[PDB]
Paper text:
[name] activates SO42− by conventional ATPS and APSK, but transforms it further by uncanonical enzymes.
Inside the cell, SO42− is activated by an ATP sulfurylase (ATPS) to generate adenosine 5′-phosphosulfate (APS). The structure of MtATPS was refined to 1.97 Å resolution and obtained in an apo state despite co-crystallization with APS and SO42−. Similar to many thermophilic bacteria and archaea, the domain III contains a zinc-binding domain (320–343) that might contribute to thermal stability. All residues critical for the reaction are conserved in MtATPS, arguing for a conserved reaction mechanism.
Author numbering:
A (entry chain A), B (entry chain A): 1 to 382
The structure:
């Protein structure tokens, strides 16, 4: 098969050097609106076509459509609302104006404001997140938004500084990379942790029916205790060098603030990976879900409502390392009792390292452990 | 699918207790013909339906058809000639007579002689074995046969004494066993050696797409150096107990003298396994072939000429244990050089044990080794 960008064509909303030049000369005659970091990232994903066919923030009819149907008005799958919020005090502009969107003191984007509209916060929250419980991070963030959403097209002037720009290839680059290597089918594997054997098992299992693997670590906010992103990248570089043939794998990052919308977000992740050029998308259990809100297989079941998605989700059956079979196996072929079975848990393996323990090599490749240990502190303190 | 016996129906040519009674009272009025042990085994396989639809030894038109087309006159696949040979001196009978076939001083079968015919030994040999080189065991055995072949139906009175009768279930028993366990698809795995990890890998790999596995050790002539058959059976019993879930495997023996006909014999083995009730038949490299006569994949390629065989051959791609991946892998997913790779060789593993060495556990399950070692001598001295 061939991977076509969501909506037919890859969006490019980067500003010409002529536009960025004049904007900053004439910036005092443009209303400024402050945005959060998550939004500045959304704006680079719009500009670089990661959110194709979006060309800016959603207008009213599109927002309502996304809430009610997870589709755009024209029926194209779209499941995560991409919106810009302002309060009454922050609203120093009107419909038709051109405004500048600032992150701190940096102008990130100019925006042609098409529509300024209101919304029901309780409907927003319940429909996106399937709950109106304030304990849910996303419901809490929805309830904190400004009263007004602002729809219209953007042009990217500046982007938030990225330490790993070298790894952050945009969709036009990953597509050309797939084509150079002769890959017609490509499987996306999304992660925010170092690779364990379970991860490798799935990726090499996909290698049997797909030409290549696109490992796509997400750069986002870090809880205290997570692996530093540098660590995830170096660990994966060690894995590929030592255990993968050379023309089977591509590693590039993408910046994206998780909304923890559960199954509604798995569709979004598939759309982003489609835009990168992928034909297939591995989906695991509890994907982008928050415990006690979404079922483990919920994020798999939702793809039944999107036959038209044109990227193939891949669901794998349960598996575990067996210490008597000495192999990754499954219940159908292994008769051994629970003490021989080791289920893979990125969290248990991380806590091991945090507690000063060595993961067995049926959990973690020796060389991957040595790479993690080569950092004086591989974990975020903030 | 459902497994139907070759030709539609399972042959039973066992003699009634009334026939065996009178035959031995009136034996002095029946010509006796001495047969080889291989032939007495052929006769039990005919009687118990292992050779369905055969009901005795082939007549002239059928023999010619099998040589030229590997099919019976009615076009049914049949590839190995099942014939009874006598010399001029041994021929104490005529067409229409009823004769007794003796192995030593034991009457094994009575036979209604339909046809006594001649044949060209050089054609026989070249067509069955693809060579007329006397160095080929089968060509040498063909050249030693009596000048006359004898066609006609048999009835089994006595069979060669079998130490493992308890394991030698006939096709009517294995079919009923499959049905009792609810297996609709069954895969045959044929062997004459103890199980190594490669064997287990294939059998459990088949378990993913088939309901059960039918491991079918062949009892036949033993070269000096082979494992005793008792050892193969106990080793497999240890393997299943320790590494297989309980309702996935069935182990029964069959007695059969290999003709070393290469690909022509792989079709015969599939027909025998079909008659046992199997739907699928694993075929490995150099199956029933003699080195420097048949290609490694020759025995796979021949099934292209038998679409109508109604038992599905299974061909597996190359694989090997990797001592850095620590797993059975393949070239597509493993980049490591030749010193990390261990290809499975039942012969190399046997020579290890003969030379007093311990096979690594990536070659042989600890418990399987301990079972073999539990015999004071696990190898045949003659
Ligand atoms: Zn096990
Ligand atoms: Zn390897």
């Amino acid at each position: 098969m061939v991977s076509k960008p969501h909506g037919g064509k890859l969006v490019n909303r980067v500003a010409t050097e002529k536009t960025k030049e004049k904007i900053l000369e004439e910036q005092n005659e443009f209303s400024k609106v402050q945005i959060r970091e998550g939004t500045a990232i959304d704006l680079e994903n719009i500009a670089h076509g990661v959110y194709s066919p979006l060309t800016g923030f959603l207008r009213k009819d599109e927002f309502q459509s996304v809430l009610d149907n997870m589709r755009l008005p024209n029926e194209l799958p779209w499941s995560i609302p991409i919106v810009l919020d302002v309060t009454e005090k922050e609203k120093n502009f009107g419909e038709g104006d051109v405004i500048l969107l600032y992150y701190n003191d940096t102008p990130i984007a100019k925006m042609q404001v098409d529509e300024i509209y209101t919304y029901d916060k309780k409907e927003f929250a319940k429909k996106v997140f399937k709950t109106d419980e304030e304990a849910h991070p996303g419901v809490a963030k929805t309830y904190a938004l400004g009263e007004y959403l602002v729809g219209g097209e953007i042009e990217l002037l500046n982007e938030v500084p990225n330490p790993f720009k070298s790894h952050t290839l945009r969709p036009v680059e990953t597509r050309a990379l797939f084509k150079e290597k002769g890959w017609e089918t490509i499987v996306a594997f999304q992660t925010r942790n170092v690779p364990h054997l379970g991860h490798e098992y799935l990726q090499k299992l996909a290698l049997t029916f797909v030409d290549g693997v696109f490992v796509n670590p997400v750069i986002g906010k870090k809880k205290k205790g997570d692996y530093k992103d540098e660590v995830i990248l170096k660990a994966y570089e060690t894995l590929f060098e030592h255990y993968y043939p050379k023309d089977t794998d591509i590693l590039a990052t993408v910046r994206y603030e998780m909304r923890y919308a559960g199954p509604r977000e798995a569709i979004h992740h598939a759309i982003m990976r489609k835009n990168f050029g992928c034909t297939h998308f591995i989906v695991g259990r509890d994907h982008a879900g928050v415990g006690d809100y979404y079922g483990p297989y919920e994020a798999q079941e939702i793809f039944q409502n999107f036959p038209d998605l044109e990227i193939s989700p891949i669901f794998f059956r349960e598996f575990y390392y067996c210490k008597k079979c000495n192999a990754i196996v499954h219940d159908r072929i292994c008769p051994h009792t629970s003490e021989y079975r080791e289920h893979f848990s990125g969290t248990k393996i991380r806590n091991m390292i945090v507690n000063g323990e060595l993961p067995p090599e049926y959990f973690m490749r020796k060389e991957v452990y040595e790479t993690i240990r080569s950092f004086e502190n591989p974990f975020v303190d903030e």
